[PDB]
C-alpha cells in the first residue's frame, strides 16, 4: 500500500468534476497565462506564403476544483490526465496544417499544484500563414504573424494574457534556426481583439520579423544577367565587316536573357505586378535588345562588304563607324549608371 | 454546482440517433460561413483550397434549460454526445477539421434550445475550369453544401441574414485571381432516394493579367520584333539572316516548352496557345521571306511588288510591322 495514497488523491479530484464546464462558469473569467518557446523557426515557403514553426506552447490557469493536500506540492502527472480535465480550446488564427505531435506518447505535460494552478504544455508544429508584399523582391522584409486565441470562449469568459512582461515571453532557441534563405531579426509580441459573428475574442499575437538574404539571387539571376549584357557589349569592339559574327552576339544574348527572364520567377506566387527583380531583368533586356538594333544601324551604312587586308592604309575600305566609337562608351556608362541607381534605391530601405 | 446538474438533466436519455421532432416537422438548420482564406487555386489539379468558419444554427427542444440566464458555451467534446446534421460538400476532394490544439468545434447552448455548432474546415473543393480564354478568363467556383441522410421531409437549409451570411470575401487577396462577386443560392435537388436540400456559395474569379505579360507576352513580342532585323541586313549576308530566323524559331520553342510544365493537358486551343502559335507564324514567315529572297537572286537569277531583290525587303519592312500590329489589335479586342 505505497502508491495507493496518490491514487486516492486523483480519484477524489475526479468525482464531482465535470470537464465540460469552464472553471467559474457563472462566476468570473478564466485568466489563461501563456508562454511560447520557439525551438526552430522552420523554412519559409514563398510559393505558399507560409512558414513553419516548432514551439513548446505553454499554458497556465487556476482551476479551483483541483485543490488537494498530499505529500507533494505538485503532481507531475501523465498526459492522460489532461484529457479528463478542462483545457482551453486555443487554436491558431492563421494555421494551415498544424500538427500536435504524439511520438511516442502524446507530447503533453500536466502539473497540478496544491492550490489548483495548472501548467499544460504541448509540442506543436504550426504551419502558419504570412501575407507577403513582394514588391521589393528579393531585397525586402516581412513580419510573419503567429496569432492564437480561444475558439468557443469569448472575451467575457476566457482572457489570455502573457506571463512575465510580454516582450520576453516568446523566446527563440539559439540552436534551432532552420532558415536557409531568410534571416530572423527578432520578434514583436502584442495582443488584440477580434469581432467575429459570435462575439469578441482575446487574441495573442507574435510577429516574427524576417529579412531575405539576397546572396542566392546574385549568383543565380543578377550575375548571369550582368554577364549577358557585357557579352552584348563585346560586339561593339569588332569590325563592321564581320556581319555573320556580330549577329551571333546580338541574338544569342537575347536567347540567354529569354532563358533567364522565364526561369527567374520560379518558386514565387504569381503576383499581379512587377517585382524589384523584374525591374532589373527588363532593363537588362533593353541593353541587349538595343545592342542588336545598334548593329542593324551600322550594317545599314556599311558600303564595302570586305574586311581590311592589312597591307594598306585608309581599293577603299570601310572606316571605323562613328556609331561604334560612341557606343563603346555610352552603353557601358548608361548600364553602370543604372547599376548604381538600382542598388541604392533598394539597399537603403 | 447548479450548472453541472442542469447539463446532466439535458443529456439523461438523450438519444443522438433521433432527429429533433423525429415524427413531426422538419428541422430548420440555418447556416453561416466566415471565410478565413482561399489558399491556392490550381489549374493543374482543377481545384481550390478554402478555409472557413462554418457555423450552423438549429433549435432542439430536448436541450432547453431554464433558470440559468447564460448561454452555456460547453467544451467541444460534448458535440460527440449531441445531434449534429450530416452536412457534406459535393466538391470536397480532401477536407479536415483543424485539430490543434484541440479539434476546433464549439457548442453554445441557448436557453430556448438553439444550438450553435461551429467548425473550422479547410476543404479542397473542385472546379472544372473553362480555360479557352486563358489567361484572360473569368471563373466560377462553387461550394455545394448538402445534407446526406435527411431529405427535405426531415431537414431544411437557409442562409442566415440573407446576403450577409457569407462574410470575409472582401478580406481575400489572391495573388493570381481577383474576386468579383459571390452569390448565395438555396434550392432542392432530387436523387434516386429523395429530395435533398442544397446550399451553394459561388464565386467569380477574374484572373489578373500582370503576371503573364512579363512571363509570356512581352518576351514573345520583343523576340518577334528581333526577327525583323533581317530585312535591314543586306541579302548577301547568308550566314547572318539565317542565324536570326533559326535562333528565333528556337526562342519561340523555349517559350512554348517552358509553359506546358505548369499547365494541364487540356485539348483545346487556349488564348495563350492561339497567341504563341500566332507569333510563331510571324517568326516563321520572316525566315521563309529570306529563302524567298535567296531563291530569286540565286536560283531565278542566272536563268504587292516585283521580283526585285531590294523591293521585297523594302516591302517586308512595312508589311510585317503592320500585320503584326494588326494581329495584336484583333487579339487584344476579341479576348479583352
Amino acid at each position, epitope marked *: 500500500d505505497n502508491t495507493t495514497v496518490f491514487t486516492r488523491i486523483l480519484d477524489r479530484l475526479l468525482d464531482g468534476y465535470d470537464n465540460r464546464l469552464r472553471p467559474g462558469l457563472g462566476e468570473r473569467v478564466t485568466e489563461v497565462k501563456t508562454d511560447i518557446f520557439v525551438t526552430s523557426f522552420g523554412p519559409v515557403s514563398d510559393h505558399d506564403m507560409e512558414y513553419t514553426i516548432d514551439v513548446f506552447f505553454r499554458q497556465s490557469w487556476k482551476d479551483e476544483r483541483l485543490k488537494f493536500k498530499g505529500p507533494m506540492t505538485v503532481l507531475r502527472l501523465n498526459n492522460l490526465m489532461a484529457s479528463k480535465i478542462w483545457t482551453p480550446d486555443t487554436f491558431f488564427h492563421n494555421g494551415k496544417k498544424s500538427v500536435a505531435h504524439n511520438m511516442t506518447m502524446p507530447n503533453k505535460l500536466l502539473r497540478i499544484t496544491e492550490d489548483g494552478t495548472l501548467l499544460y504544455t504541448m509540442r506543436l508544429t504550426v504551419r502558419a500563414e504570412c501575407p507577403m508584399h513582394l514588391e521589393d523582391f528579393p531585397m525586402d522584409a516581412h513580419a510573419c504573424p503567429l496569432k492564437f486565441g480561444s475558439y468557443a470562449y469569448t472575451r467575457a469568459e476566457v482572457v489570455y494574457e502573457w506571463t512575465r512582461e510580454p516582450a520576453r515571453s516568446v523566446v527563440v532557441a539559439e540552436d534551432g534556426s532552420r532558415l536557409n534563405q531568410y534571416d530572423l531579426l527578432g520578434q*514583436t509580441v502584442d495582443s488584440g481583439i477580434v469581432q467575429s459573428s459570435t462575439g469578441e475574442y482575446v487574441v495573442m499575437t507574435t*510577429h516574427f520579423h524576417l529579412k531575405r538574404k539576397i546572396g542566392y539571387f546574385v549568383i543565380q539571376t543578377y550575375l548571369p544577367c550582368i554577364m549577358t549584357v557585357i557579352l552584348s557589349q563585346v560586339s561593339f569592339w569588332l569590325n563592321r565587316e564581320s556581319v555573320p559574327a556580330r549577329t551571333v552576339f546580338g541574338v544569342t544574348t537575347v536567347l540567354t536573357m529569354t532563358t533567364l527572364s522565364i526561369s527567374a520567377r520560379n518558386s514565387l506566387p504569381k503576383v499581379a505586378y512587377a517585382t524589384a527583380m523584374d525591374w532589373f531583368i527588363a532593363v537588362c533586356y533593353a541593353f541587349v535588345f538595343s545592342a542588336l538594333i545598334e548593329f542593324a544601324t551600322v550594317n545599314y551604312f556599311t558600303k564595302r562588304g570586305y574586311a581590311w587586308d592589312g597591307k594598306s592604309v585608309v581599293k577603299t575600305f570601310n572606316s571605323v563607324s562613328k556609331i561604334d566609337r560612341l557606343s563603346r562608351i555610352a552603353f557601358p556608362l548608361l548600364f553602370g549608371i543604372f547599376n548604381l541607381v538600382y542598388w541604392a534605391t533598394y539597399l537603403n530601405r | 454546482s447548479f450548472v453541472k446538474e442542469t447539463v446532466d438533466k439535458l443529456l439523461k436519455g438523450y438519444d443522438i440517433r433521433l432527429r429533433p421532432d423525429f415524427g413531426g416537422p422538419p428541422v430548420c438548420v440555418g447556416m453561416n460561413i466566415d471565410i478565413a482564406s482561399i489558399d491556392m487555386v490550381s489549374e493543374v489539379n482543377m481545384d481550390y483550397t478554402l478555409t472557413m468558419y462554418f457555423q450552423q444554427y438549429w433549435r432542439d427542444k430536448r436541450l432547453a434549460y431554464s433558470g440559468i440566464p447564460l448561454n452555456l458555451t460547453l467544451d467541444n467534446r460534448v458535440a460527440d454526445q449531441l445531434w449534429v446534421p450530416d452536412t457534406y460538400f459535393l466538391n470536397d476532394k480532401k477536407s479536415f477539421v483543424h485539430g490543434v490544439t484541440v479539434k476546433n468545434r464549439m457548442i453554445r447552448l441557448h436557453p430556448d434550445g438553439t444550438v450553435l455548432y461551429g467548425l473550422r474546415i479547410t476543404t479542397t473543393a473542385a472546379c472544372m475550369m473553362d480555360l479557352r480564354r486563358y489567361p484572360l478568363d473569368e471563373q466560377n467556383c462553387t461550394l455545394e453544401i448538402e445534407s446526406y441522410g435527411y431529405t427535405t421531409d426531415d431537414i431544411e437549409f437557409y442562409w442566415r441574414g440573407g446576403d450577409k451570411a457569407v462574410t470575409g470575401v472582401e478580406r481575400i487577396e489572391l495573388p493570381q485571381f481577383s474576386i468579383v462577386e459571390h452569390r448565395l443560392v438555396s434550392r432542392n435537388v432530387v436523387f434516386a432516394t429523395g429530395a435533398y436540400p442544397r446550399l451553394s456559395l459561388s464565386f467569380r474569379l477574374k484572373r489578373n493579367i500582370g503576371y503573364f505579360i512579363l512571363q509570356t507576352y512581352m518576351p514573345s513580342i520583343l523576340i518577334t520584333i528581333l526577327s525583323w532585323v533581317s530585312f535591314w541586313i543586306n541579302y548577301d549576308a547568308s550566314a547572318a539572316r539565317v542565324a536570326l530566323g533559326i535562333t528565333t524559331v528556337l526562342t519561340m520553342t523555349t517559350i512554348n516548352t517552358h509553359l506546358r510544365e505548369t499547365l494541364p493537358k487540356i485539348p483545346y486551343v487556349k488564348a495563350i496557345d492561339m497567341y504563341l502559335m500566332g507569333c510563331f507564324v510571324f517568326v516563321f514567315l520572316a525566315l521563309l521571306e529570306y529563302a524567298f529572297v535567296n531563291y530569286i537572286f540565286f536560283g531565278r537569277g542566272p536563268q504587292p511588288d516585283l521580283t526585285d531583290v531590294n523591293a521585297i525587303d523594302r516591302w517586308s519592312r512595312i508589311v510585317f510591322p503592320f500585320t503584326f500590329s494588326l494581329f495584336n489589335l484583333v487579339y487584344w479586342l476579341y479576348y479583352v
Partner: nanobody
Amino acid sequence: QVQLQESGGGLVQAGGSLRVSCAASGRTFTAYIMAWFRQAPGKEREFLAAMDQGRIQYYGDSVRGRFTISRDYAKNSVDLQLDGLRPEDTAVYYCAAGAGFWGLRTASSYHYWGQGTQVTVSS
C-alpha cells in the same frame, strides 16, 4: 500616387462622440495594416489603434476601451469611433498603412501616411 484622404470632425463638446474616417485610393490595402496615430503639439506621434487583415484590433494602452477602429475592406477605408473625448485628446490624428516590420506600435514601419485632422475637444 497613393493618397490617404481623411475626414471626420474639427470641434466637439467634451463628452461628445466623433467619427474620423480615412478613405484610400491608388492601392488595395486589404493586405496591409491600417492604423491611426496621434501627435500632440510639442509631443511625438502616439499610437491609437490598428486593425490587421484578420480583423484584429490592436489598441493603445492609454486609449483602450474608448476608441473603436473599424475597417471597410470593400471600400478600402478605415474608421475610428472617437468616444468619451477628454480635453487631453486634442491633437492631430493621422491615418497610416504599412506592413508593420518592427512595427504595429512603431511609427517608422508605416510607409503610407495621411494628411492629418485637427480634432479639438472644448470644455
